[PDB]
Amino acid sequence: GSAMGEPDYEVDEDIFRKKRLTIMDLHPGAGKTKRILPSIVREALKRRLRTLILAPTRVVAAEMEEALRGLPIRYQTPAVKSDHTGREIVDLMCHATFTTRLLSSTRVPNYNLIVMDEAHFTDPCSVAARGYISTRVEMGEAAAIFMTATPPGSIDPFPQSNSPIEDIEREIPERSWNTGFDWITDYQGKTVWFVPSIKAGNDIANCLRKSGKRVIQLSRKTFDTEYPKTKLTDWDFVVTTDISEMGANFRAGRVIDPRRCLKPVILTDGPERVILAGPIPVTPASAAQRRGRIGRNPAQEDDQYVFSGDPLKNDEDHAHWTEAKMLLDNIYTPEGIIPTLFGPEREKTQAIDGEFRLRGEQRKTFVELMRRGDLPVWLSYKVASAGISYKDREWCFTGERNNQILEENMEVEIWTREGEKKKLRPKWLDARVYADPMALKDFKEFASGRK
RNA sequence: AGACUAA
Ligand SMILES: Nc1ncnc2c1ncn2[C@@H]1O[C@H](COP(=O)(O)OP(=O)(O)O)[C@@H](O)[C@H]1O
Ligand SMILES: [Cl-]
Ligand SMILES: [Mn+2]
């Protein structure tokens, strides 16, 4: 039994059995991260189990550290700055960090227990990690716990909450506004506003600030300084990207959710390429997670979820299913085995098994292009599998005529590290490296040989 | 677009 939001004294022993994968499918705010997780960790320490804890984002990592403070845990995330003895048997890191470690040099510990929080995260690295984890379990080398309110196949955007939620459909602005949206600033509580991009977030926050609103912006770029401010200071709005979609305890009263964002899609008509499609409706799982930021406090009964449009369950044309396979085909168990995707996530795309496996040197290039090059999984794979070395940038210029990149409707030209002026015309097109002006600037640095 | 930045 438990009280006062404190971890339970009692933990089922069966969750620690090798060959067992436990899905903890409990509604938002039930206590997965800050109550159940510490119980598991405490018991895993008593059992002397080599343990891995996985957060999707630094937001969830920060929530975990609050719940786990004082326990001998080695934090491998910049979100947390803690003293480590180097003798810890519990590691904590983000999903993508684990997959990166799996892909690289560099022996990963043989964990006996793996706890993944937000085990539905559709990031290609997270899907890949779930493949590796479920394979370790199946092989008898690990027990694993997958925690999420929205496990694969979830279709309900309005799940259970600790307190009643008032679900409201209204038009929501995507850009600044003058009139017509008084309900936004008339509201007297705290609002978490999900925006599809940092650029849109800047515009909306700037607009809210001219109404005399205290606004905190949250994203990968601002997390380090801004997240503690959501915890320690008084604010009216949090304008946030998907960084905050999961796990956050904002102690807020309202979520504004336009339920729409851009997604990478692989096109297979004509030469294969990646576009940024949409903005398109989010999945029911994403909508339920965003909504799940409120109705979290039983003593607070008038919380609101303001949304626009229906969700779209079908995400099968999304690049993340293929990119997860590209990653997982290149991960090995120490026994030598090919990891398979987590059951519920198999046959999301009709790609043949092991078809993305790279040979030795090409595998090393593949990792470099992602980590050093800041290139998407798909693009890194295309370049690596063509036998191109990390430093050879000729492919950025030898694409067909139609692959010419434009900026402000002019042909982008590169001045190379050796002095030549060349037109940016890559052999493979991935809109993620040219759509956003900042991304294009970076890809221009890459094409120059300055990355 | 968004997230991740570890041996
Ligand atoms: N800093 C905090 N102060 C007060 N209550 C909190 C705090 N953080 C979390 N809670 C509450 O504890 C409950 C369980 O939280 P959590 O473990 O984050 O839920 P889950 O992981 O299932 O979404 C929620 O009702 C939440 O609002
Ligand atoms: Cl909360
Ligand atoms: Mn949680």
DSSP sequence for A345-383: GTTSS-PPTTTT---THHHHHHHHHHHTT---HHHHHHH
Q: Which of A221, A234, A243 is nearest to A62 (CA)?
A: A243
Best CA proximity match to A354, nearest among A381, A370, A331, A334: A331
Cβ neighbours, 10 Å, residue A180: 9
- Nearest one of A121, A125, A129, A123 to A152, comparing CA atoms: A121
CA of A92 to the centre of ligand 2 (A): 22
Which of A77, A255, A73 is CA-nearest to residue A158?
A: A255
- Atom index in ligand 1 nearest the CA of residue A162 equals 25
Q: A95 a known binding residue?
A: no
Give the closest ligand to the alpha carbon of residue A250: 2
For CATH 3.40.50.300, list the domain ranges present in chain A.
1-154+315-352, 155-314
Can you give the C-alpha Rg of chain A in angstroms? 23
Amino acid making up residue A264: P
Exposure on the CB side of residue A314, measured as CA atoms within 13 A: 1
> Is A278 annotated to bind ligand?
no
Longest Cα–Cα distance in chain A: 71
- Contacting residues for A239 by C-beta, under 8 A, at least 6 apart: A193, A195, A201, A204, A205, A208, A215, A216, A217, A218
To 5 degrees, how large is the angle CA A410–CA A416–CA A422? 40
In the numeric block, which tokens belong to residue A431?
Answer: 């809109």
Cα(A275) to ligand 3 centroid in Å equals: 32
Q: What span, in angstroms and rounded, lies between the C-alpha atoms of A224 and A61?
A: 12
Which ligand has the minimum distance to the alpha carbon of residue A38? 1
Cα-to-centroid distance, A395 and ligand 2 (Å): 49
A33 lines ligand 1 (CB under 6 A): yes
Helix axes A124-138, A320-328, angle to 10 degrees: 50
* Residue A420 backbone dihedrals phi, psi, to 5 degrees: -80, 140
Spatial contact of A264 and A320, defined as CB atoms under 8 Å apart:
yes
CATH code given to domain A155-314:
3.40.50.300
Burial track A76-112 (b if 16+ CB lie within 10 A, e otherwise):
bbebbeeeeeeebbbbbbbbbbbbbbbbeeeebeebb
Ligand 1 binding pocket mutation candidate from A291, A296, A301 (most atoms within 8 A of CB): A296
Class of domain A1-154+315-352: alpha beta
Strands A303-307 and A51-55: unpaired
In strand B, which positions have an atom below 7 A from any protein CB? 1-7
| CB of residue A249 inside a 6 A radius of ligand 1 | yes
Give the C-alpha distances (Å, rounded to integers) separating A311 from A155, A158, A288.
9, 11, 10
Task: Measure the CA–CA gap between A136 and A385, rounded to whole angstroms.
Answer: 27
Q: Which residues in A238-266 are b (16+ Cβ under 10 Å) and which e?
A: bbbbbbbbbbbbbebbbbbbbbbbbbbbb
What is d(CA A71, CA A437) in angstroms, rounded to the nearest whole number? 44
Decide whether any atom of ligand 1 lies within 6 Å of the A30 Cβ.
yes
